[PDB]
């Protein structure tokens, strides 16, 4: 019943460290657009601030042996083995996570930083996994939930969580650091038009081709969080697309069950969907998000009528063909619209309109890669111009 890591699997690295007599668990969030460096995401707290899984996801490429060095002188779904040279790639971008001749960081006079690049050239383009304690040897298959130690093939340095300015940083050094993995998603199963958690998708209507539309920044001074409705060119473009994040870290990129509580985040402005006490949405910011405020569930039917998931074989929900209704997990209110005398205000009614069905539209692979590209580009652009202004 045990599971073994294979090639082309989506994994995430967690580290545990001691500070102020309490236990902080962090994930390795790598950004490769505004900067080439890497930082740590504070995923230790989850009932206060939800972490982001868009940048901490990592997908394997191949499992090479240390003695299998071609130096320019894959059968398929290969298993992972201890003491093997593993390629660490990035999920949303083509950045290949490996060490280089970087010496920009001199906080400890001995530790280096690891960068991101597209070219898989030179010798420093692989990592080797090693067992933590003396219970696993080299040669056996790596199970799920065990501890792995990562060391570069050129610097011979481990991922050390050194303190530079009483903050969190990632440094390549010699201090042993415990690292773990989590099976976010598998490679054996594909999308094939079925719902996959963590993706980016749109919410359309039945026949009127109508969807949510956050306005532009013409009134962002005070009423930025206000939302409205628009149809036509917005539906065919990427304005009504959101990325859903599961609360749990393990198996986040799996099938989403009915009634699963999660939150919706805007991929253009960068805000979380939430409901306030005055029957108004007002969205939610990253620094002041709340689990109770940001909690949404997918209801199979309008009428009210096992928790851990490890096998994705249900596929009960389908893109487009399946019709689902959005409902809160605590208040139980339903999304409703009022035909005012084509912008409409979102008001959470109690009974809910019967003719208010929601259709799930997913950006296909022809445009979804483009979709992650544009959302990353606009995020970096707006953040950098705000920082400059």
């Amino acid at each position: 019943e045990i599971q073994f890591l294979r090639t082309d699997d989506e994994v995430v690295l967690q580290c545990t460290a001691t500070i102020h007599k309490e236990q902080q668990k962090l994930c390795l969030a790598a950004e490769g657009f505004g900067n080439r460096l890497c930082f740590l995401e504070s995923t230790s707290n989850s009932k206060n601030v939800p972490p982001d899984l868009s940048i901490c996801t990592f997908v394997l490429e191949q499992s090479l042996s240390v003695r299998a060095l071609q130096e320019m002188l894959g059968g398929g779904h290969r298993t992972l083995l201890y003491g093997h040279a593993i390629l660490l790639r990035h999920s949303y971008s083509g950045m290949y996570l490996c060490c280089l001749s970087t010496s920009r960081s001199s906080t400890d006079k001995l530790a280096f930083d690891v960068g991101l690049q597209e070219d898989t050239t030179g010798e420093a383009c692989w990592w080797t996994i090693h067992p933590a304690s003396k219970q696993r040897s080299e040669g056996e298959k790596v199970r799920v939930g065990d501890d792995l130690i990562l060391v570069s093939v050129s610097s011979e340095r481990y991922l050390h969580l050194s303190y530079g300015n009483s903050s969190w940083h990632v440094d390549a050094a010699f201090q042993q650091t415990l690292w773990s993995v989590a099976p976010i998603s598998s490679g054996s199963e594909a999308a094939q038009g079925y719902l996959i958690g963590g993706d980016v998708l749109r919410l359309l209507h039945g026949h009127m081709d109508e969807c949510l539309t956050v306005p532009s920044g013409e009134h962002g001074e005070e009423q930025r969080r206000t939302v409205h409705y628009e149809g036509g060119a917005v539906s065919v473009h990427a304005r009504s697309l959101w990325r859903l994040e599961t609360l749990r870290v393990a198996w986040s990129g799996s099938h989403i069950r009915w009634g699963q509580p999660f939150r919706l985040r805007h991929v253009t402005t960068g805000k979380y969907l939430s409901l306030m006490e005055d029957k108004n949405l007002l969205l939610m910011d990253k620094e002041k998000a709340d689990v109770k405020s940001t909690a949404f569930a997918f209801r199979s039917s309008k009428e009210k009528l096992r928790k851990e998931v490890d096998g994705m074989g249900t596929s009960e929900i389908k893109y487009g063909d399946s019709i689902c209704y959005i409902q809160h997990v605590d208040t139980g209110l339903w999304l409703t619209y009022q035909a005012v005398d084509i912008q409409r205000k979102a008001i959470m009614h109690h009974e809910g309109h019967m003719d208010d069905g929601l259709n799930l539209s997913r950006s296909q692979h022809e445009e979804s890669r483009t979709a992650r590209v544009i959302r990353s580009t606009v995020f970096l652009f707006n953040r950098f111009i705000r920082g400059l202004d």
Partner: protein, 48 residues
Amino acid sequence: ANVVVRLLIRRPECFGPALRGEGGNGLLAAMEEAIKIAEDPSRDGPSP
């Protein structure tokens, strides 16, 4: 040489009496400290 340097570099053992943080081995300060504490005074700090 390979195994000797790997073992020596695997753990930091050279204490640094003038640097900060992990590692040490700062010649630019330790050599000056040695030549200012050994030339005029004796092997001890307080010495005629």
